[PDB]
Amino acid sequence: GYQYGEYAGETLERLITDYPGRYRGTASFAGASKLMQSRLGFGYQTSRQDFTWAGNRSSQNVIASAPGSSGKFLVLGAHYDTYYGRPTLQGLDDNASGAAVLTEIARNLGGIALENGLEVVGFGAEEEGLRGSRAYVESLDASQRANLLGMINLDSLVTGDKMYAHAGSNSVSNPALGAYREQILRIARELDIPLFTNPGLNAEYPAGTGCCSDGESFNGMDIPVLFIEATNWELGDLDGYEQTDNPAITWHDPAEDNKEVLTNALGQERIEQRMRDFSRLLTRLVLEQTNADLLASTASGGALARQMEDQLQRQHQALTRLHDRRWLTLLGSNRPVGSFDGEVGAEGEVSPDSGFDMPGNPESRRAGVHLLGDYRYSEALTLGGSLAFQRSRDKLDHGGRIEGDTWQLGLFGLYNDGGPEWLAGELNLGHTRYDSKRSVYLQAAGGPVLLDQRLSGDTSAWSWGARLEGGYDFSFGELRSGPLAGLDYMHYRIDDFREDEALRTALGYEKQDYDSLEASLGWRLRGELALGARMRLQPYASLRWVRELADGRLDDMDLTSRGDGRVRVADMGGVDKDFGRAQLGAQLAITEQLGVFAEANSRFAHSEGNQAGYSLGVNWQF
Ligand SMILES: NC(=[NH2+])NCCC[C@H](N)C(=O)O
Numbered sequence: 001g002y003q004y005g006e007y008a009g010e011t012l013e014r015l016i017t018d019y020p021g022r023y024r025g026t027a028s029f030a031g032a033s034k035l036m037q038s039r040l041g042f043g044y045q046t047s048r049q050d051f052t053w054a055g056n057r058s059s060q061n062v063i064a065s066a067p068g069s070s071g072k073f074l075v076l077g078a079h080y081d082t083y084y085g086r087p088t089l090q091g092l093d094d095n096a097s098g099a100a101v102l103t104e105i106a107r108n109l110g111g112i113a114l115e116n117g118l119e120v121v122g123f124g125a126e127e128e129g130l131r132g133s134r135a136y137v138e139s140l141d142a143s144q145r146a147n148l149l150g151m152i153n154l155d156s157l158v159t160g161d162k163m164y165a166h167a168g169s170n171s172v173s174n175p176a177l178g179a180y181r182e183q184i185l186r187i188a189r190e191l192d193i194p195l196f197t198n199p200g201l202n203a204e205y206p207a208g209t210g211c212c213s214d215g216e217s218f219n220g221m222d223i224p225v226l227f228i229e230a231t232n233w234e235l236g237d238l239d240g241y242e243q244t245d246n247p248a249i250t251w252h253d254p255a256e257d258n259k260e261v262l263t264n265a266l267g268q269e270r271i272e273q274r275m276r277d278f279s280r281l282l283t284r285l286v287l288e289q290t291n292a293d294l295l296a297s298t299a300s301g302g303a304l305a306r307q308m309e310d311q312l313q314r315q316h317q318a319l320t321r322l323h324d325r326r327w328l329t330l331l332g333s334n335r336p337v338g339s340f341d342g343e344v345g346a347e348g349e350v351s352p353d354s355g356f357d358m359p360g361n362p363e364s365r366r367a368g369v370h371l372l373g374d375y376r377y378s379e380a381l382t383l384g385g386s387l388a389f390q391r392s393r394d395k396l397d398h399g400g401r402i403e404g405d406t407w408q409l410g411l412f413g414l415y416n417d418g419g420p421e422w423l424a425g426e427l428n429l430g431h432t433r434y435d436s437k438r439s440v441y442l443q444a445a446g447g448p449v450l451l452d453q454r455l456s457g458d459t460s461a462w463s464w465g466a467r468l469e470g471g472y473d474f475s476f477g478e479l480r481s482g483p484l485a486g487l488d489y490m491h492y493r494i495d496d497f498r499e500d501e502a503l504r505t506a507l508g509y510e511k512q513d514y515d516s517l518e519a520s521l522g523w524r525l526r527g528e529l530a531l532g533a534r535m536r537l538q539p540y541a542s543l544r545w546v547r548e549l550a551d552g553r554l555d556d557m558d559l560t561s562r563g564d565g566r567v568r569v570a571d572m573g574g575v576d577k578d579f580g581r582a583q584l585g586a587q588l589a590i591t592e593q594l595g596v597f598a599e600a601n602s603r604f605a606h607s608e609g610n611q612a613g614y615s616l617g618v619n620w621q622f
């Protein structure tokens, strides 16, 4: 997509060349307004609103609106009108740059969900005595004025060497009025964007505040106001009229303010760079202010929490698969009770990136240690334990990464009287420690990177539960296979953790107390192909369905952003409660003690959820 400000440059060129000399009662003005609406119409319900003042005098202003859940919109006003006594002559410095940056911001916010709506307003006939802004405020009713979260104004975004962003003249009463001024100062400081403010040297104007722009009408209410202009308050009468210390001339007039003249005197690189800086700065300000960044961060946090729960369930399903391999081994050559029968080994797993489902493209890989041991008399029932370690570095998108060491303790008892029928049981306990590193990559459709922040966090989550399986089967030849039924239960608990990073996008999680009840039914296989003097392969595969009787995994979490702290409901999507998983592989025995394996587990659902996974490990039975 287009970089930061390139689209602003394109729309500036179109505005200044195709429709120069835009003023009230002009066909060029109508063409310019049509162009203005056409530029920012992406993702907006643009609707020009004609107004009148003093009878015959009338004009119109472009309004682009984005629906907001909170019902309080933020207004980005910037007129596209030139001086009245300047017909058919391009006005660049006056507000062409402002209009270009405004359309740039409107497009960069297009297609983005916003908790607070954005109402990009392109004013007109402003040079005629602020008619557009006053008429817009007049059209506002009590509800709109109550819901005016704030106002941002643009004007003369090129000529001024040092850019400024000063709040309204009403900042003297409420010290908190200049909230937008403070936010834009913070963003400019954090993005290496030089942005001063009003020095307040002149007593005629309030310190840190501007005047004589669109927000003169918005000052009527105690709402944040932000004038964004490029001037030079340390030069001339300290009122910004001499906006540039360069030779140049300086304001809107026929004799100056032309594309070629500005390019020759101030350099095209300067105008382009200032337009890019304004685009990026205001895009970040609108993101942080309309809480669109908070909405994106909460959406990414919901995705991260869902993926963390999926990682925990994947780890415990890997533990149960290890138990299943041990049971496969145990179902043959029962051997005398007692003696030495402990087992140990390392197991690894590679998860293909084809799982998808979760928004982060979950490419994962598992590895770790595990222990085993089991003996009991009568050779029918044998109960034993296991001590497992696992570190599944489930990797998100845009550099996101989740990883956690895990300790697992299980007690399982396998019962078989030597016949076709068998049954068993199982329990588990897991004390993992996630090191969350998620990414919040928010960008417009075809637009540049609006914001790319990486959060970090540390959480410990416990998990317990129970399990049991069994069945019976016949066999043709040396290989057996038949129906197996099982019950899986795990009451995961993910403790609340707050992100270490101090940003707006950092989140504050909550305790997750949810249970998964995977009732199952399927078919299994088990055989022995003893090719070689010591090798005895154990083919085995499964095709079993699962139907949850409960939530399975938490759907919606109450999250609060560190920037604001309000209660935000984040949706992690639906929970696939109707699917089935399949297994495949075999187990080798290099000797009586050593033995490798290669199991592939592949959850399959026809509607949504097709996770896949491979695994290879070696057991030293000693
Ligand atoms: N001292 C100032 N605030 N000067 C800037 C005035 C800009 C003027 N309202 C315009 O739109 O062209």
Ligand SMILES: [Zn+2]
Pocket: 082, 083, 094, 127, 252
């Ligand atoms: Zn002007």
Ligand SMILES: [Zn+2]
Pocket: 079, 094, 095, 155, 156
């Ligand atoms: Zn202006």
